[PDB]
Amino acid sequence: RKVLIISAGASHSVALLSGDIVCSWGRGEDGQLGHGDAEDRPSPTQLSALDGHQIVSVTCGADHTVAYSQSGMEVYSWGWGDFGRLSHGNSSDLFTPLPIKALHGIRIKQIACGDSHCLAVTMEGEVQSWGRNQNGQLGLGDTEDSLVPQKIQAFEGIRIKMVAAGAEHTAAVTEDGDLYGWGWGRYGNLGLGDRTDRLVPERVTSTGGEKMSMVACGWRHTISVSYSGALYTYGWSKYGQLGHGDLEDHLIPHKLEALSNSFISQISGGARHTMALTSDGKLYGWGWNKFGQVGVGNNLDQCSPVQVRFPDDQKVVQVSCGWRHTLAVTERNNVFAWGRGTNGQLGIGESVDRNFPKIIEALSVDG
């Protein structure tokens, strides 16, 4: 079957396959795999509770997972409840997928989760957020938790295209190309030219004169792409995750000039590493590589983008960063994984680390 979506969290991985099949693997201790038990799974395992629910999207937070169905009009979540903050009014452990009843019937465009908060964008450009709000990451104007989703009123009259969630911060781009940041901002990762937290979304004005089409977040860094395919990074670079060939912080978006010859079509942020996919199918990685998660065949941090290589230079069509691992799908409908593997999150079966892409036989044609 075709792999439609891949997503990765702290220590787990999830995929959506053609034919409405959800597959999860890796660490299971807090229910994030959704199979009704707490066991790790070192190979992709079908999430049977969602059979026939016509799931169209899946995404991972740190130890939490969310999925939604268009036809069912339903959003589901499971995994770590963060002491009530992410279990949307349920006192149960979520070891199997549970509907978020406040989101039923809402037409969902996108869901993003960070460590302790999630956001949903509706087809009309509205944003609803829920979870922990200690640093304003929900965008609601205070630091009060919201177990039940609530609309970000700061965006009234502004159609949001996509959102991204880091550890304790949040970013968004509008349909018109404006870029926003809110939440924890001490490393400059909001892009606002300072180190202050924001309790409501604030517009990033130093965008190189460009409109932005996409944003992604890691722990303490943020990545955006402009309409011309230029890539920008800002925030923490202690591990090279901003990619500018040094370890300098940036408090406003900084164009990654080494990629200027390429048009970036997709981006992903890990905890302390970064992935960018060009329109040509070339995948570039940089940042923290202690566990091999950049994919360049060693365990040394990479402060400049390096091309990740696949057999016969088959093109990459999708990439997703977890905290310490990375997943990618290719044009041959192969799925590769690399990085930290000790809880099974590479899905290769033997729960070991890899510093170079390795094929997931269970999801791949050349498997």
Q: Which of 23, 76, 81, 22 is nearest to 345 (CA)?
A: 23
Q: Which burial class, exposed, middle or buried, applies to 104 when counting CB atoms under 10 A from its CB (0-12, 13-18, 19+)? A: exposed
CA distances from 67 to 51, 114, 216, 220 (A): 12, 14, 19, 25
Does the CA dihedral 59-347-324-294 come out positive or negative?
negative
Helices (runs of H) and strands (runs of E) counted in the chain:
0, 28
* Cβ neighbours, 10 Å, residue 156: 8
Cβ atoms of 326 and 293 closer than 8 Å: yes
Does the CA dihedral 298-302-304-310 come out positive or negative?
positive
Cβ atoms of 181 and 201 closer than 8 Å: yes
Residue 298 identity (one-letter amino acid): N
Cβ atoms of 232 and 224 closer than 8 Å: yes
Distance between CA atoms of residues 4 and 57, nearest Å: 9
Distance between CA atoms of residues 218 and 189, nearest Å: 9
CA count, 13 A, side-chain hemisphere, 353: 14
Q: Please name every residue paired with 329 in a beta bridge, in sequence order, or none if there are none.
A: 318, 335
Cβ atoms of 9 and 61 closer than 8 Å: yes
Cβ atoms of 35 and 361 closer than 8 Å: no
Token pair recorded at residue 99: 């509907």
Distance between CA atoms of residues 267 and 259, nearest Å: 13
Cβ atoms of 44 and 1 closer than 8 Å: no
* Cβ neighbours, 10 Å, residue 299: 13
Residue 61 identity (one-letter amino acid): G
Q: Which burial class, exposed, middle or buried, applies to 160 when counting CB atoms under 10 A from its CB (0-12, 13-18, 19+)? A: buried
Experimental technique: X-ray
Token pair recorded at residue 271: 């905890």
Cβ atoms of 325 and 340 closer than 8 Å: yes
Cβ atoms of 319 and 330 closer than 8 Å: no
Cβ atoms of 213 and 225 closer than 8 Å: yes
CA count, 13 A, side-chain hemisphere, 186: 6
